[PDB]
Amino acid sequence: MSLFPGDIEELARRIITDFTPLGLMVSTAESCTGGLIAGALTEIAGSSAVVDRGFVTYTNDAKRDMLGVGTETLTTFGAVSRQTALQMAHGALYRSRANFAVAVTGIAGPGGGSAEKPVGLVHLATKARNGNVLHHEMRYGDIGRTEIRLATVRTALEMLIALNQ
Amino acid sequence: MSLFPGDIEELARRIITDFTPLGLMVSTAESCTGGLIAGALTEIAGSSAVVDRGFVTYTNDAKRDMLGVGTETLTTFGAVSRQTALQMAHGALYRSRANFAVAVTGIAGPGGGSAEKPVGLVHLATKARNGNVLHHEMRYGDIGRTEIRLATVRTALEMLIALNQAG
Ligand SMILES: [Cl-]
Numbered sequence A: 001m002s003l004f005p006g007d008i009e010e011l012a013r014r015i016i017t018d019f020t021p022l023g024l025m026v027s028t029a030e031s032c033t034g035g036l037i038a039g040a041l042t043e044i045a046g047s048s049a050v051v052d053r054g055f056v057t058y059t060n061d062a063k064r065d066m067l068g069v070g071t072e073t074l075t076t077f078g079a080v081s082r083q084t085a086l087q088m089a090h091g092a093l094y095r096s097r098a099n100f101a102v103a104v105t106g107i108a109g110p111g112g113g114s115a116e117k118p119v120g121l122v123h124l125a126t127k128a129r130n131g132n133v134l135h136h137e138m139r140y141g142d143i144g145r146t147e148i149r150l151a152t153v154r155t156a157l158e159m160l161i162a163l164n165q
Numbered sequence B: 001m002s003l004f005p006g007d008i009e010e011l012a013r014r015i016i017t018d019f020t021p022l023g024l025m026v027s028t029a030e031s032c033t034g035g036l037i038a039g040a041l042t043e044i045a046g047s048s049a050v051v052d053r054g055f056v057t058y059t060n061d062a063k064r065d066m067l068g069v070g071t072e073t074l075t076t077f078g079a080v081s082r083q084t085a086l087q088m089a090h091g092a093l094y095r096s097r098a099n100f101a102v103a104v105t106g107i108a109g110p111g112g113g114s115a116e117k118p119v120g121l122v123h124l125a126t127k128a129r130n131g132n133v134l135h136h137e138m139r140y141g142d143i144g145r146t147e148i149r150l151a152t153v154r155t156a157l158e159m160l161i162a163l164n165q166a167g
């Protein structure tokens, strides 16, 4: 039984396989994927060596409380912004024992879209203790709630791999 | 598009459907399922009304920091125990705005099994603000890592429903 599609499962595999000999651990912070990024990473046998913790923070209160996202960041730029994603990744990294953190915030739909922030808009950020930061703004389109969530999982994993090189 | 087994999706849908008019929210604390319980609940449109937050406490450090599980519970009873499950549920509840928390700690395998704590052993606990707690020890068997994880998600969702019925 494999829950995730093969690209996601392979990317998760590569991360566990790569990170273990390097002694590297990961933390996740999720606000649209609902735990699926941690879920995908932990599908892999041996993932206990690598996965530290995950923060599932749909609510803006949870983003502030669990990850230290600023109240004014949220009120000025919204939950779904570059600024929020960066602060989420910073919080997930420093509030964990991980070497790398990836954070995502987006609109999976069907609800919650607008001209300015459409369904499928997702901001992703990854940060390393060495200081390296990567951010991408993705606009997946109105392609379905599960579809956007899985698209986001794949991008998050790709970013962890990239960060590591 | 489906991601989880139909019956798991049905259970998640029941929780979102029931809890919304009741104004109730849930938090999850996950070791062995790695976020799939929150994942399953948030497959449902409208789940944002109900799902407050989730803790994936894959390590013992995480159980301690995020949930306040005691070092004393962990070295005496183990990460996989009724006691750890109860403390996780309590921690997830009172470190959130939820009405109910569900916590799971188990051995998905393939590794880590022993006679006393075999692969497929999972402790689940749900707690409500009024103090009501439910706990189940499951022994799903050595049936595969994804299989045990999904079996755990199912039971976790069943228990949230039961805990609500009892309130
Ligand atoms: Cl493992």
Ligand SMILES: [Cl-]
Pocket: A111, B044, B045, B046, B047, B048, B049
């Ligand atoms: Cl929703």
